[PDB]
Structure formats: C-alpha cells, structure tokens
Write a protein that binds this ligand. Structure first.
Ligand code: WBX
Lengths: 237, 300
C-alpha cells in the first residue's frame, strides 16, 4: 500500500527499493509566437530514480528528440518514464533488482504497473510523503549533465557523496530531503548557504561541499531557518 | 407453448419466471406455470418468504426436455428435475391444466422485452459457464462466485465467466503498453472476439447472461462481469459499427428493465460515467445515454 510517516524506517531496511520521480521528465518554456499566440519549447529532462538506502541515483536523461512528432506529451511522459524504469530493472542482475518501486506521484502507478507485468513480485507503491525530489535540477552538477546532453543518456551518481562513512542511511536521507526542501522553497538563499564559505569545496567526484560534522550541523540549522522563514514570508506569520 | 408442473408448494415463496413474479402461500394449491414461449431460454427463480437470503433459480430451455419443480424438504429448496417419461409427463400436465391449477406466463403481445434481454443467450453457452453436465438446466444463486473471484472457493459451484483483466499480459502486447492500455481494441478484437468468443454474438450472450444473473440473483461477480464487458468495448477506439449499434440496443433494454430501487447497487458510477462521457464510444450509444440521463441522472 501507500508509503507514509507510519512506515518510514522501511526505507532503510535491507529490501532493495527505488524511488521514482517523474516531475522533471517533460520540461518546457512557454513563449509568444510572432503572431502573438503561445507556444512551448521543450528542454532536456530526466527521470530521478533513487535507492534511499545506498544513495545510488540512476539519472536517465530525456533528450528533447524523444518528443518530436508526438502528441499529448504530458501523458506520454509518464509512459516513457515507466518504459525507462522497466528497462533499467531488466538490465540489473536479479539479485540487484528492487523488490519495491515507490512512485512520487500517483499518475505513475498504472503506467509503471503495466510496464512491469513481467515482474509480478515487484511491488509498485505510491506515497503520502510530499518529497522534494523535483528540486534535483537545483543541484548544479545534475542540471549541467542534463542540459549538455545531445542524446539519450544514463548517468550514475551517489547523491549522498561519502556521507554513509559517517552517518546512517536514515540520517543521510533526512539531510538530503532537508537540502532539497530548502532548494525548492528558495533556491538562491539555499545555494548561498551552501557555498558562502569559499574554504569548503565540492570535490570533483561529489555533488555537495565537503562539510565537517560540526559544519553540517550548522548548515542543517541554517536550512531549517530558511524553510521556516519562507513559510512566514509566504504565510505572513 | 410449454409447461413447468410443480409437484406441490409446501413453503411460502415468491416465484419468478423471467421478468414476472408472483407470491405463493404455504401449502397453496399451486401446480406450476403454463403457456411459456418456445424459442427463448427462460429462468425460473425463488425467494423464500421466511428467508429472503439466497435468491436462487434455474436456467432452462423447454425444447431440451420436460422439466418440473419438486420441493426437497431435506435440502430446503425448490429443485428443477427432468421427467424422462414423455407420455407420463403429458398426462400430469394435462390433468392440472384441466383443474386450472397453473399460472399463465403473462406475456403482452406488443412486448418484446424478454426477447430483447436474451437475444444472444443460448443454453449451450450457459452450460459452459455453469458446469453441471448431468443436467440440461442450470442452477444459479446469489452467493456463487466467479472463476476470477476465486483467483482473488469451491470450483464445482462457480460461474466460469470469461476472465477479463485490463492489467494482464493477455491484454497488453510487449512494446505496446501505452497503446494497448489506453486503447483496448487489440484486446477486444484479436484476443477476445477472434481468439476466445469467435464472434460478437457469443460475446453479447455472456454479457446479457451476466446482467440477468446480477439483476435476478443479486450476484455480485456477475455484475462485475457485465460492467467489464461494457467497458472493454467502450474503451476500444476500433469496434465494428454493427457491434456498437447492437450494444446500444442491448444496454437500452437492460437499463429499461432494471428496478429503479436497485440502481444504487447494480450500476457502477465510474464505468457508466466513463463509458457515456469520456470513452472512445461516448457518442455512439444514443439510446442508452438518453434513457440513462432520464431515469438515473443521479448516477451521472
Ligand atoms: C419414480 O418417481 C416418480 O415418478 C415421482 N415423480 C412423478 C413425476 N412427477 C412430475 N410432476 C410433473 C411432471 S413429472 C414428480 C414425482
């Protein structure tokens, strides 16, 4: 069934699972035409498929050519996501395939279920959590690989960098979702928080700065303040 | 015209014959039903006065033998049986017809209702859905589950309707997932019509037989099967034009006949709103949509 606050520790047990987010698969800019009508222009996209235990991120880049000559693109985008997730699972060795796939939006359930009929043992689940994975495109190195791609492409990342050396997957996921929530509520403030001090760098093989434990506590505190703030600024409280 | 003799009516019962029904009192001098139209299947059905639980009944065709009802006091129900001895059946039937102890099947001459509800239903197909080969008639009741219901528990007492499941490998061609889920024409025309049913007449017969079992026995899995078969057509972009025309007639008479007070349990809001207003065939069921809007606008 659904994934919610009551069964949250299930994400960090030893059953392989994947989160699938499709919010950045079909992306457009809207503009005016010379005749004063409106038109969209698509830009590159990506499926965000994450193992929350390990931090492994399978980023499938969705090049704009896949939309050429197609109709009802927002509906097709869901089916294309399910087609790509299904293809990924089939490419993994059997002991690497997930036992559950949790989708962040309920419109992905039927598309994914139909694409995965060959895998009756893999449970396809929704969630009640309002997870901030749409903000993945605010992570600079991820945005950059998507925008540069000239063809369909899969890139592999670890979204926790080396954090699991020092913390559990439950704390790494909490850290990630606080960072993404912040980036989604106010990207500019969030990014200033992360990069202000120039003596803390992002290693070439990482996505985030090389903070110490103490510095992560400070950083984490500053992200909470930002989120509560914006929530006042937004709700005047 | 043919006749179903009752040995006797020991327990107070409401008796149904097709869309007609009448009350018989405990130990009333009732000896059965006459002037039944030849040419159609028929259903004779029962609801005890003491226990409104378990509606039950028998599908039969008088061309296939001489049948009578005899109350069994051990099993507690009106049982249909076949008399092999023809001359001896004629004597009994003639004796009660002289003594006027039978109700006449009350068909109005203008009235095509039963023909319209049963146009494609055949006894031979009924007997494949209801497996009890030693009898020429078929027993159905409220509680019998379907083959698909048992997959989701006595197999001998089941309704073997054709399993339809929109999220199944049968329904979905590899590499056509989105096409086949959003447009079910492959599943309808190739898998079901060409492959399983062979023609649309057999398809329409099962659909009519499921509706009738839903309406007369309140059989839930039958209702499920009737809606599934409507939805498969309404959700296919490509359907032969003759099939749409007959579907509209079929459902029209089903909707006309449904008791008004049973609409809340026999009609599935989602399926009907989808079928009439969202599906490929939203504009192809003129008679059915008009009767539905004028009789059950609440559901829509
Ligand atoms: C050997 O046992 C019997 O013969 C008993 N039956 C006689 C025929 N009975 C029928 N009623 C109407 C048509 S046939 C029912 C009872």
């Amino acid at each position: 069934g659904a994934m919610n606050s009551s069964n949250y520790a299930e994400l960090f047990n030893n059953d392989i699972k994947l989160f699938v987010d499709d919010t950045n698969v079909y992306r457009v800019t809207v503009h005016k035409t010379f005749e004063g009508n409106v038109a969209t222009k698509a830009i590159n996209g990506c499926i965000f498929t994450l193992n929350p235990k390990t931090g492994h991120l399978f980023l499938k880049i969705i090049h704009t050519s896949v939309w050429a000559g197609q109709k009802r693109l927002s509906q097709l985008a869901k089916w294309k996501t399910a087609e790509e997730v299904s293809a990924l699972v089939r490419s993994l060795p059997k002991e690497e395939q997930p036992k559950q796939i949790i989708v962040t939006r309920k419109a992905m359930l039927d598309p994914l279920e139909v694409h995965m009929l060959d895998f009756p043992n893999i449970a396809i689940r929704p969630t009640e959590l309002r997870l901030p994975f749409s903000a993945a495109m605010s992570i600079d190195k991820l945005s950059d690989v998507v925008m540069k791609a000239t063809e369909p492409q899969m890139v592999l990342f670890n979204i926790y960098d080396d954090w699991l050396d020092r913390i559990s997957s439950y704390t790494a996921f909490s850290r990630l979702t606080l960072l993404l929530r912040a980036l989604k509520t106010n990207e500019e403030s969030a990014k200033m928080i992360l990069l202000s001090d120039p003596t803390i760098t992002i290693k070439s093989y990482h996505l985030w700065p090389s903070f110490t434990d103490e510095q992560w506590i400070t950083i984490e505190s500053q992200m909470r303040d930002l989120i509560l703030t914006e929530y006042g600024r937004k709700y005047n409280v | 015209m043919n006749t179903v003799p009752f040995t006797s009516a020991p327990i107070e019962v409401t008796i149904g014959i097709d869309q007609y029904s009448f009350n018989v009192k405990e130990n009333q001098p009732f000896h059965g039903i006459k002037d039944i139209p030849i040419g159609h299947v028929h259903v004779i059905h029962f609801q005890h006065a003491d226990n409104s639980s378990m509606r039950y009944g028998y599908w039969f065709d008088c061309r296939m033998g001489n049948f009578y009802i005899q109350y069994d006091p051990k099993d507690g129900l009106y049982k249909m049986m076949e008399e092999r001895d023809g001359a001896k059946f004629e004597n009994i039937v003639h004796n009660f017809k002289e003594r006027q102890m039978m109700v006449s099947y009350p068909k109005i001459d203008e009235d095509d209702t039963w023909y319209n509800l049963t146009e494609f239903v055949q006894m031979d197909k009924i007997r494949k859905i209801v497996r009890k080969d030693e009898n020429q008639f078929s027993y159905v009741d409220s509680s019998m589950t379907t083959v698909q219901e048992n997959e989701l528990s006595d197999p001998a007492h089941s309704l073997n309707y054709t399993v339809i499941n929109f999220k199944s490998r049968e329904a979905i061609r590899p590499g056509h997932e989105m096409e086949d889920f959003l447009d079910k024409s492959y599943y309808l025309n190739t898998v079901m019509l060409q492959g399983i049913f062979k023609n649309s007449s057999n398809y329409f017969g099962e659909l009519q037989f499921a509706f009738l079992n839903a309406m007369f026995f309140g059989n839930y899995g039958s209702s499920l099967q009737w809606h599934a078969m409507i939805e498969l057509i309404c959700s296919s972009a490509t359907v032969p034009k003759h099939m749409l025309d007959k579907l509209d007639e079929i459902l029209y008479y089903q909707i006309k006949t449904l008791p008004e007070q049973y609409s809340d349990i026999l009609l599935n809001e989602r399926v009907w709103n989808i079928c009439l207003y969202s599906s490929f065939q939203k504009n192809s069921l003129h008679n059915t949509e008009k009767i539905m809007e004028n009789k059950y606008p609440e559901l829509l």
